[PDB]
Design a protein around this ligand. Structure first.
Ligand code: G89
Ligand code: CL
Ligand code: CL
Lengths: 99, 99
């Protein structure tokens, strides 16, 4: 699809067996999801943005379905105010910025 | 152009006759720039990012070139970790997300 930016570019995702709404975010290096359980090992990480940093759990090799497209990669889980699909998974679904 | 997301979508902007680097950020509603001087009066605004809420200076109707495209609109000035071009100016340069 072609998504305009008049409003937030929100899409439905499936992760960990759950449906969520998330932002397609070209300004995010990584994918950051609100607190949930995911299987496997994880390690702590700190990520920083406007406001400062939050501690997250880093899970690798997680499959997400993003607007009907499957990707795999690292997902960070923690107290983000919004679910964010970052560049690590946007690349996998072939997303580009066009103007 | 078509910009892929394997790397940060950094572009050159020009504001106040100065060149700066900024991130095209579809996850940002607003454009937020590091401390600089701008003309006119400003208004207060609070914005909430990943790490909490900060205070910024809101300047309206500011001339800014983005990747060689001309925009005129609201620029928020404050302690952001990187200059971010948000949807208020991404729409002015005709940007869309495509996959
Ligand atoms: C390492 O991976 C990372 C992934 C993401 C981030 S980041 O989220 O800090 N982040 C990294 C950027 C700052 C370099 C990604 C951004 O797109 C961020 C997304 C956002 C939206 C709403 C609430 C909170 C965050 N937008 C964001 O900070 O936008 C600001 C805050 C205000 C919100 O209402 C939405 O727009 C207004 C302008 C940092 C690191
Ligand atoms: Cl990854
Ligand atoms: Cl590609």
């Amino acid at each position: 699809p072609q998504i305009t930016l008049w409003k937030r570019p929100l899409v439905t995702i499936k992760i960990g067996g759950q449906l969520k709404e998330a932002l397609l975010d070209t300004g995010a290096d990584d994918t950051v999801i609100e607190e949930m359980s995911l299987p496997g090992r994880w390690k702590p990480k700190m990520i920083g943005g406007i406001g400062g940093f939050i501690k997250v759990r880093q899970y690798d090799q997680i499959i997400i379905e993003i607007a009907g497209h499957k990707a795999i990669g690292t997902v960070l889980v923690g107290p983000t105010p919004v679910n964010i699909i970052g560049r690590n998974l946007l690349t996998q679904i072939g997303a580009t910025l066009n103007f």
